[PDB]
Structure 1
């Protein structure tokens, strides 16, 4: 809703969302979580504590230092866990699904859910399932999780060329150059430190970036404290621009990545198609397949699907934010749903929802948002073929 929330990017909480299908194919990111790393917090504290020792803090800086120490105590032992908000986000997603399509989850419908080995994903799965079971205890439920699903849910860890690109690829200097251009650390640090001009540009920038990082994740934690007012709206905008680019180039369809970050997702697109074909043919009789994973799962998956906008290949870094927006693709609890329908002539239609809003594909249909499954499957198999050919060039 608000521009300020949007600028949290992938850390934005899941936005407000207040015939009948025969099958639902789902992928969801875990819900709102605690920060995963204490690195940024420790950086901020270390700078403010060192300043306090040399009498370099303003009044606001002292108050910030106390706030940071408080957060350090609250975050302790909570790193990476799903928060209460994260649980409620999943309940809302499950609740709207049951309310919108009750016939599908009626009687003794069968559902399967899988998750990664990461606890926040498993807990997200469980918040979702508990809501399904609460609404219909007569559901048949298969629940599993773990590294057995790495190939489809954590492909971003398994591809050596991609891991290399992620850690040291040519996207790196472009990001750093972009940050230096967009983020002016002095006016921000002036609020907290006496003589902020004494700080070297690199330390000043690392401090400011770490502070943004702490402020951005705070709304996902359910802790009733807020740090958005540490920065102006313009500074948030600029920060978001940098993180948006970082995500785009490291995880999506940026020309610098050569579609490597997108191509690695094909086994999941392949598995989505297989689960659907098995239900359609009667080989499986599941009414829904749910999958719980990560932003790094959702982003290239959505790009590989070719949902309009999300796989744009933008050559100019400053243009990326106009065309590709991470908070529309992968907020907390980001999810893709394929809803399958059978018409009166037994033709199969599919509707794609991205965060519960109809998505477009670059194929035609006479009845948007519904697409012919036949056409859609053909398009998706071409995407998988393109993925494999891309991967054949970076054969590790």
Structure 2
């Protein structure tokens, strides 16, 4: 909620969140995790060590180097793992769900959960399920995971055109230019390094961007250390703008991506509709389907749903941060829940929660936040059709 927390972007910890539905349809990112790569930590260390050898550190830089060496030991063998904070985030999400809708999960209700093959997502599922079971051990629970779910949870790895775009598409030079524009490395490096102006701009920006990366992830690790004060608030604001743009262009509805990053999510939207239709019809008798995956899953899924603002197509890179904010969409433990209700005339209504807050769709309803399922399904089906059309052009 603080400005500083928000500027961690997709690395922001899940925010504070302190009738009765007949079905809940869920997608959740894993909870708060350790950094996935040592790359940024190694860069910062190499720069500071080289400086130490040539007598190039300030007192603050020597202290920073000491801290970086410490984090290197603490991160060792922990890369990419769910942290204790990440487990508690899932416990909180499950706990509020059970507390809000006890009748749904009462008696011998049936639930199913799936996860990707990635350990932090499986462990997030388990933190969530363990909370459900503790509250009602009489639940019937199906738990599965792995590469069999790649088509719906890891579609971003399976589409060749998208993989090419993500790795070398036209968004890259836009992002790099924006970084050069927003981030001035010299004043930051002045804190840690003697003669910071002697550094070339490329190496200077790589160092600063790496240091921001280390600082941004630290609150997700449950390690009792903090580096927010390495940078001023304006510096964090600028860094956030650059990473926000990176996420928007590489994973969401940026014009430069031509909706390719969004279109690839259609199989998951299809599966969401299918699981709901089966419960409504009686073919399935689950009270909930839970799914645990990644920000690479959640971001395009939310845009494809067309939750208001998340699918905006903004042409000016400088304007993106005004209209589209990654920390509002995909913080750590980011989740989408569709809650289904039957009224006293047996009409079916759906409420959409994004990070446990009611979300709007660009269709009408006389009882917001509840939408007609019939209207909603028709709208989502049109989104899927649009997605298939988009992909028909980028087959490569």
Q: Please indicate the TM-score interval, normalised by the length of the shorter structure.
A: over 0.9
Write the deviation string for residues 217-262 of structure 1: whole angstroms up to 9, x where unpaired.
Answer: 0000000000000000000000000000000000000000000000
Q: Offset at 1:131?
A: 0.1
Quote the Cα distance in structure 2 between the aligned partners of 1:268 and 1:224: 38
Q: Offset at 1:38?
A: 0.1
Query: How many residues end up aligned between the 2 structures?
Result: 396
Q: Offset at 1:195?
A: 0.2
Write the deviation string for residues 14-62 of structure 1: whole angstroms up to 9, x where unpaired.
Answer: 0000000000000000000000000000000000000000000000000
Secondary structure of 2:26's aligned partner: strand
- Residue aligning to 1:59: 59
Quote the Cα distance in structure 2 between the aligned partners of 1:341 and 1:328: 26
Write the deviation string for residues 108-137 of structure 1: whole angstroms up to 9, x where unpaired.
Answer: 000000000000000000000000000000
Write the deviation string for residues 358-393 of structure 1: whole angstroms up to 9, x where unpaired.
Answer: 000000000000000000000000000000000000
Q: Offset at 1:344?
A: 0.4
Alpha-carbon RMSD across the aligned residues, in angstroms, is: 0.2
Quote the Cα distance in structure 2 between the aligned partners of 1:126 and 1:205: 40
- Residue aligning to 1:354: 354
Quote the Cα distance in structure 1 between the aligned partners of 2:388 and 2:186: 47
Q: Offset at 1:101?
A: 0.1
Secondary structure of 2:206's aligned partner: helix
- Residue aligning to 2:146: 146
Secondary structure of 1:104's aligned partner: coil
* TM-score normalised by length of structure 2: 1.00
Q: Offset at 1:74?
A: 0.1
Q: Offset at 1:216?
A: 0.0
Is residue 2:155 matched to residue 1:167? no
Secondary structure of 2:248's aligned partner: helix
Q: Offset at 1:282?
A: 0.2
- Residue aligning to 1:187: 187
Q: Offset at 1:197?
A: 0.1
Q: Offset at 1:211?
A: 0.1
Quote the Cα distance in structure 2 between the aligned partners of 1:3 and 1:87: 24
- Residue aligning to 1:18: 18
- Runs of 4+ in structure 1 over 2 Å off: none
Write the deviation string for residues 278-311 of structure 1: whole angstroms up to 9, x where unpaired.
Answer: 0000000000000000000000000000000000
Quote the Cα distance in structure 1 between the aligned partners of 2:46 and 2:390: 44
Q: Offset at 1:347?
A: 0.2
Secondary structure of 1:114's aligned partner: strand
Q: Offset at 1:356?
A: 0.1
Quote the Cα distance in structure 1 between the aligned partners of 2:234 and 2:224: 24
Write the deviation string for residues 177-213 of structure 1: whole angstroms up to 9, x where unpaired.
Answer: 0000000000000000000000000000000000000
Secondary structure of 2:339's aligned partner: strand
Q: Offset at 1:270?
A: 0.1
- Residue aligning to 1:214: 214
Quote the Cα distance in structure 1 between the aligned partners of 2:89 and 2:36: 19
Quote the Cα distance in structure 2 between the aligned partners of 1:49 and 1:361: 52
Quote the Cα distance in structure 2 between the aligned partners of 1:385 and 1:305: 12
Quote the Cα distance in structure 2 between the aligned partners of 1:9 and 1:309: 17
Quote the Cα distance in structure 2 between the aligned partners of 1:273 and 1:325: 27
* Stretches of structure 1 lacking an aligned partner (at least 5 in a row): none
Secondary structure of 2:212's aligned partner: helix
Quote the Cα distance in structure 1 between the aligned partners of 2:340 and 2:68: 48
Secondary structure of 2:46's aligned partner: helix
Secondary structure of 2:352's aligned partner: strand
* TM-score normalised by length of structure 1: 1.00
